[PDB]
Target: Oxygen sensor protein DosP
Amino acid sequence: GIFFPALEQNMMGAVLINENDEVMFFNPAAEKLWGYKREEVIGNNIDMLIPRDLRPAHPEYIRHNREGGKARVEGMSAELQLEKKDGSKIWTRFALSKVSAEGKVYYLALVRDASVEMAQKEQTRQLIIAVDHLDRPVIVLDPERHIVQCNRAFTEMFGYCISEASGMQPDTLLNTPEFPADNRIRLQQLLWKTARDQDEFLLLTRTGEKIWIKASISPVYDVLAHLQNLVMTFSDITEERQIRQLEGNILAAMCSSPPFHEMGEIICRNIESVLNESHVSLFALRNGMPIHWASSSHGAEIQNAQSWSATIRQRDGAPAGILQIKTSSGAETSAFIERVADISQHMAALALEQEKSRQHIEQLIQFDPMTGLPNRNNLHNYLDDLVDKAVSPVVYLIGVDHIQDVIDSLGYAWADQALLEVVNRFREKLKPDQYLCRIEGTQFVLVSLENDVSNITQIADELRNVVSKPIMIDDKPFPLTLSIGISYDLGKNRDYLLSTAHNAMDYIRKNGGNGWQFFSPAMNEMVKERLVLGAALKEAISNNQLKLVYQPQIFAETGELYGIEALARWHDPLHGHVPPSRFIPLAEEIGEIENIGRWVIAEACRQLAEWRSQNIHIPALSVNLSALHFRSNQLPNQVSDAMHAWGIDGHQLTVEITESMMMEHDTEIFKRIQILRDMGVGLSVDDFGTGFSGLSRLVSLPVTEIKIDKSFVDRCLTEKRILALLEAITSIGQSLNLTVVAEGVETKEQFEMLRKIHCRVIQGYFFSRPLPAEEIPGWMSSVLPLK
Amino acid sequence: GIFFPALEQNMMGAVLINENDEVMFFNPAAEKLWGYKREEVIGNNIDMLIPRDLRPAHPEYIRHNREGGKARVEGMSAELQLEKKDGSKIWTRFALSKVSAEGKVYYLALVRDASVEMAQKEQTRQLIIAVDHLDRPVIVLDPERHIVQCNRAFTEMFGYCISEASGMQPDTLLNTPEFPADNRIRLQQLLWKTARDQDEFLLLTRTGEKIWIKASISPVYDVLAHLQNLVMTFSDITEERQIRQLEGNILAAMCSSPPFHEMGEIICRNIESVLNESHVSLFALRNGMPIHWASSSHGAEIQNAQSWSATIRQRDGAPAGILQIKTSSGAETSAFIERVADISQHMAALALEQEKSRQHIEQLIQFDPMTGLPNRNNLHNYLDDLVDKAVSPVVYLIGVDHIQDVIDSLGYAWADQALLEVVNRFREKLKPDQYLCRIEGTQFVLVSLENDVSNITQIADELRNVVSKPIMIDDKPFPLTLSIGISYDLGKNRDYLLSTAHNAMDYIRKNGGNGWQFFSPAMNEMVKERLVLGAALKEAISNNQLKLVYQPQIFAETGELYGIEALARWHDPLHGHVPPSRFIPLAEEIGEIENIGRWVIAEACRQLAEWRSQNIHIPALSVNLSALHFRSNQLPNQVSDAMHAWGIDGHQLTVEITESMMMEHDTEIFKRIQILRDMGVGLSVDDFGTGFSGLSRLVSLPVTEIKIDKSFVDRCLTEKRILALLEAITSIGQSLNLTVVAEGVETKEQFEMLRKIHCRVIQGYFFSRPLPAEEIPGWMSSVLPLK
Ligand SMILES: Nc1nc2c(ncn2[C@@H]2O[C@@H]3COP(=O)(O)O[C@H]4[C@@H](O)[C@H](n5cnc6c(=O)[nH]c(N)nc65)O[C@@H]4COP(=O)(O)O[C@H]3[C@H]2O)c(=O)[nH]1
Ligand SMILES: Nc1nc2c(ncn2[C@@H]2O[C@@H]3COP(=O)(O)O[C@H]4[C@@H](O)[C@H](n5cnc6c(=O)[nH]c(N)nc65)O[C@@H]4COP(=O)(O)O[C@H]3[C@H]2O)c(=O)[nH]1
Ligand code: HEM
Ligand code: HEM
Ligand SMILES: [Mg+2]
Ligand SMILES: [Mg+2]
Ligand SMILES: [Mg+2]
Ligand SMILES: [Mg+2]
Model:
């Protein structure tokens, strides 16, 4: 047989044993494997080749195998420790063969030196230990981008093992959630990058949780500079992204320069959002003492909690503050607490140097570096100057509320721009004698010098409705609102005024939303009374409870009634008699002048209808109209309706407009005046505030009557210089066909002094007090003529 | 036998080839590796067993080995690929033996399925790559207390390789090379005795520099819970503190909101300081084109520069930039490089997101967040709207020079306060029609609608003069100065207007500032002509080069001279005759009105004395004065001097004022007028801008003459309505003893139509043109009376 020399020249070792456990063959490699010799071993027992641990208990195994008769020798199949002659224990791999030759059971063993293979196995055991020890998910991929090796951290975080996660792309079994736009494409693209790269993904666990991971792919090239493998390292970056969101939010705050305490609050809120059910406290070092900058309002008690304190230092190393975080022990990892506290320490450190720089310069600066408005110090100086000069100012604290919506929808920058738009609206509606300043954030001060409650109410209404129009920000409306606190005393102090106005403003802010309120509710009950009176006036106008009273006008010489003026009256069961000189400005403020005009015109035409049905001539009726009633582009329609519904065509009706209308210069108003005058209804102008150039323009824009006011007729007695007004106006009267109507006559001397200038018509108490309609005909039929 | 059946049932596959290279042996072990059976391999050639890619190459090796005749075949000692019957390939390990018996040479090839062994080797290679990509130094220690396996980070941060550190231990002997650290006994005995230990060392490197390293040690137990292995992970405390400090410093720099290039440079310097001897640069993507953002100015060539590139990604979406850091090879650990790259990549992502946000801020917001003023965007919109409405705007570009003085002396905060001081001054002097904007920093833009030199120069002078008083910063003056460029051209656009204004402003700034300039030629030429004309007027007034010319006023009936009016005339050799309507507004603009008033009064009194020297009665002389002349508390002094230096007491002199003076309401001016009237000098009022109430107050503050303007007298011909104006004015005249003077008569019909109203006196071209004083007595002696 040629196998004997084949085994002699072979690399393996052949040790064939006969029935009596005697070695019948010994190849040269057996000398290297055992340190023996063929002369020493051949013919002798196998006891020399067995490890000393179990030398005598091995013929028992051999004998047990001998009687079985099985073909294959399934035993002796694992790498086993073999001890040499010198005592060294190498690792060998065996391969047995039962040879039943000539009725005798032989045993052949193809021993191979498993030293190198088991050194590889020891190396891979150590590498498995080192790769499962670090808790760092690492996978390895072929050029086809399929997983070939994974680790224990990867299994822990994704729930897949080497058996399941092998041969498939790391996206087929780790598909991203429903959102398909970017995650799937980025995950598929990272796997096919030929250079070192990395990305961040949402991957799905076997159970189904959403975990943000950071995957880093790097190629490993062979000797021939060819792609051999691609290793992917996954980092669980849930906490990393939490701290990154913290960094982003603190950056967006600090770069936008927020207030000190609000910055502390947002820092604390981010820390709590990263560390659930914890307590956070933050202190600055002022004069070496702790000053409480901010802390979370969630002061829940925690048992066996750990408190980590970090000394917030300055740039040069000097201490600046203390940042203390108390949290449940074991709920959040200590190293994560360290990293969060360190990053927040740097953030709050820069915030603290900024605040320290601002601290010794805020008392010296005079302007707000944001909106360009004067600051609290400038306001204090201005108020001190006012009180020293003995002037009583009125302070409006304006709180621009509902700013948090733009804060959390757009950002601090866009919210500050909303503030700028609001203050620019304030500037465009501002007045020369008003002082505007910013005290703290959304809080402004308007210092005015208006004493009247009506003026204060009008200013408050204009301030509250300037923000009624939505604020346009990035093509997104924002309905901001104002809480106004009004403080005013005869004089107490700037501190007192500010404190009272702040009390009012915080009351309004906490008890609802937009609105304005006085301090000292004795000045708010007045507003309530005026509002209820206005509501009563509106409902009386609606329900037709108003009344008109008529005052005859007389000719100078003939003693004949030129006309009667319809003066409004009101009588409420609760308020008694409300004078026109009290409810006409109220109607102007509310917006009831239009309704009053329609009502007076309709009632006047109706009463003309009855006084024509019965035998009364009623030559002319003068109806009072205001500025808004004429500026509205509707008047001639209802005036013509009033004439043609009762046959009272305009040669009888007359309108007296305010001198403010003549002072105003509006082409549309002038055209409407001309159209009305064309219809035959007369026109009268009272008072002489408008100049004689205005009166000549009024000659151009035709009228019929000019009224001399009671304020001038009263001084006609004493001031003899104003007789020229009456004389000249009368002269214009007979020059260009105007009727002059003296008002406010009360005494015989006052009438007879105007008698010489030959005034056309006279109206006042000297001839008839305003008489009710039910006895106007009695006066007509009894008194006229008067002479 | 002991040859054939020995290897038939063996695990090792046995194949034998004879002289004719024909296979003779084949066993089930080789069947399981080739796919064939014992009916297709015996007899036929070895050609089928070879893989298809090596069939022609293989057979020469057998012949070469036969020729060589060597006993031990060193060939095929490595693993070999194997092609099965079906075409699949597996790895196998060969043991080749040659037989020289019976004069024949056979070949036996004991094959073993090296599939599992080579899978183990590939697994070991993959695990080695994975451990090298672990980002933390890891060492594995045997129970014999020595070092077995290292990492790549360990080799990078200590310089010790697997060949040097393997077998023996450079841990017990190299942990305390020169510094004992008082923990060698811990690392020797307590390290293998306790479990889960850790401490800090000063273990040295190849260089020997002292570094603080963590030595976290954990034991790995076997099934018997015995000390199978240990693992020690290292972490450089210096590296950890440096990587925390890098993040802190970068975040602090980013919190200061620096420019984009400065932020890139700051990241560059921080990365270089963390990694000395490095060239670092950043690029930011722009529409897919990577542009240069920042780079390290140290351009010295770096030897063996390994470059690490990182791809910036925002919170979600496409890449935003690149960051490349090239450092000398071996300078720092790859894990250190990767950590620095990751931190700086997230920092650069934050910086790019912040710059995108700032681009949105500069692109959409219409207000500057430092002064509350509109920015260049609002300026563009306003000018575009105006030019689309086709109204020509006038643009002023103002620059506040000399700001570096405040910046250096008091810092940036007080420079900010100075800019807000100037902006508040602009706002205080601002007019409702004007629009104010802040294009950038030192510069501002004011947009107006008035377009004429007399107003442009005035508003530019006001803007330049608003900074006459130094800005009070911390009780310290600072004299800032203004450079203004003015642009106005009909029909042009905002780009042209802004460019021209900036050209003018830049030119004046380069020339030295402290002033303003128009764009384009002939505009500054008109300005210079006006300036030289004003200087000539000033010197002519000083040197008494002006003259007076007198226009007689006649009575309606008697044809007697009521008075003459003194009208200023000037004859300059260069400018010829300069009309009063041309040089009086110039005097108002410059400030020569007072000098003109003194000269006119003095010369009028001198000519009155000269005429009194001979036989001239000259009942009255009228002298024109302006508003600014009477607003100073000096008028009565020189007027009384003029009367009493020539005996021309005010019963002959007369003063006519502007209607704007009576429009104004000043108690001091009224008292001065009353005092002057008490001296006997008359007063006259021209034009009828003031109202009739103003005329009655004028009667209260007595006057003497009312003049009907030529503008009204001309329209008296056509507009028949304004006859009432004259009638009423004359009526007031005879009512309260005023003289009415009708100006600007030209025709006999114009005279006769005003005759019927009985106007007191008439002045115009119908009776006498303005005559020089040298022949005025000739007119007196030859013309009067006129009738
Ligand atoms: N002491 C005194 N007073 C005299 C004398 N002659 C008339 N009066 C008063 O003068 C007022 C006439 O209305 P007015 O002067 O246009 O001033 C009116 C007018 O401006 C307004 N007003 C009155 N009625 C209306 C109306 O229907 N509509 C509107 N829009 N305003 C009205 O209310 C003002 C006050 O009206 P009244 O309270 O009725 O006060 C009446 C009347 O009582 C007199 O010899 N002595
Ligand atoms: N076409 C025409 N013109 C007539 C007629 N009658 C008079 N004039 C002119 O009308 C002007 C009247 O001067 P003014 O209206 O007071 O307005 C004066 C006055 O405001 C100003 N002015 C003239 N002299 C003086 C002066 O000495 N001092 C001051 N402060 N202003 C003066 O210059 C203005 C222009 O006066 P002049 O150009 O000198 O022209 C004079 C006079 O010559 C007439 O029938 N037809
Ligand atoms: C380092 C050297 C050796 C070690 C560690 C060793 C140990 C073992 C072990 C563990 C078994 C299996 C026991 C069982 O399955 O219960 C076995 C069985 C056996 N050994 Fe060894 N032995 C060694 C040397 C040898 C040699 C040189 C031969 C030469 C013929 C041999 C012949 C056998 C036979 C025939 C069996 C019976 C296998 C069976 O019953 O399945 N042994 N020995
Ligand atoms: C998949 C199967 C086989 C492959 C891939 C293969 C390939 C090779 C290679 C690469 C060598 C050169 C090795 C070196 O230079 O280090 C070689 C040599 C040789 N092979 Fe093969 N072979 C295969 C099968 C066989 C078989 C089955 C036999 C004999 C039964 C054989 C006999 C030889 C001989 C005699 C040499 C000469 C070695 C020397 O002279 O040093 N080969 N073969
Ligand atoms: Mg009335
Ligand atoms: Mg009245
Ligand atoms: Mg004049
Ligand atoms: Mg004039």
Residues 240-362 of chain A form a domain with the Beta-Lactamase fold (CATH 3.30.450.40).
